[PDB]
Design a protein around this ligand. Structure first.
Ligand code: PEA
Ligand code: CA
Length: 223
């Protein structure tokens, strides 16, 4: 997260860290046995880490649970990042509590200008590299679909939206991939891609979760 702030421990209780020996992506807890992330985060050997603040220190609220199954969206296209969403089932149910909680799925899509909370353990620099140990947060509005498409001609589909600031300085970045965009209490986006981080006229692009709610709910119920 560039241009953001320290969330404070367990203030984002649905935020998960995906770990394969190291943090590599975020995700969101949507019920006690299922996490939503980005399809471009797919890999074998995933451990889900819930209740994290400092990912390098055991602080007392963590739950580490191996993934039993990953389900990349049937139509994921890794070239274009269309349909950049993946479900991860936990080998055992998370113990839900204050510091570990699910986030609701949308009931409908969110509107341009809606303010959202984006969070992660990604790079905090727009030039260079600095990875935080504690969770970072950013408040950012959903941008109009026309400014998004103008920013990235030929690359935005109906399954994507942009959020952030056209002036730059505030954005998601490397290592934030897969994590949540929460607006009005609902998971409306997943950190997906962009052109660099926090650059002018290059806002973050996010998977548009409201298009996937029927797939998510059907998939979970059948798995
Ligand atoms: N705003 C761009 C976020 C991002 C950065 C690098 C890889 C994936 C996603
Ligand atoms: Ca920790």
């Amino acid at each position: 997260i560039v241009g953001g702030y320290t969330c404070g421990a367990n203030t984002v209780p649905y935020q998960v860290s995906l770990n394969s020996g190291y943090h590599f992506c975020g995700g969101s807890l949507i019920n006690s046995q299922w996490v939503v992330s980005a399809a471009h985060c797919y890999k074998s050997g995933i451990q889900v880490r819930l209740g994290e603040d400092n990912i390098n220190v055991v602080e007392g609220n963590e739950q580490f649970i191996s993934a039993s199954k990953s389900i990349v969206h049937p139509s994921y296209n890794s070239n274009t990042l269309n349909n950049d969403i993946m479900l991860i089932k936990l080998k055992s149910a998370a113990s839900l509590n204050s510091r570990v909680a699910s986030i609701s799925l949308p009931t409908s899509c969110a509107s341009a200008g809606t303010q959202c909370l984006i969070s992660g353990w990604g790079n905090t620099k727009s030039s260079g590299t600095s990875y935080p140990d504690v969770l970072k947060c950013l408040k950012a509005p959903i941008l109009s679909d026309s400014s998004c498409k103008s920013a990235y001609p030929g690359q935005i589909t109906s399954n994507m939206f942009c959020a952030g600031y056209l002036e730059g300085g505030k954005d998601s970045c490397q290592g934030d991939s897969g994590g949540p965009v929460v607006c009005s209490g609902k998971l409306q986006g997943i950190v997906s891609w962009g052109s660099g981080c926090a650059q002018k006229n290059k806002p973050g692009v996010y998977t548009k979760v409201c298009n996937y709610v029927s797939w998510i709910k059907q998939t979970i119920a059948s798995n």
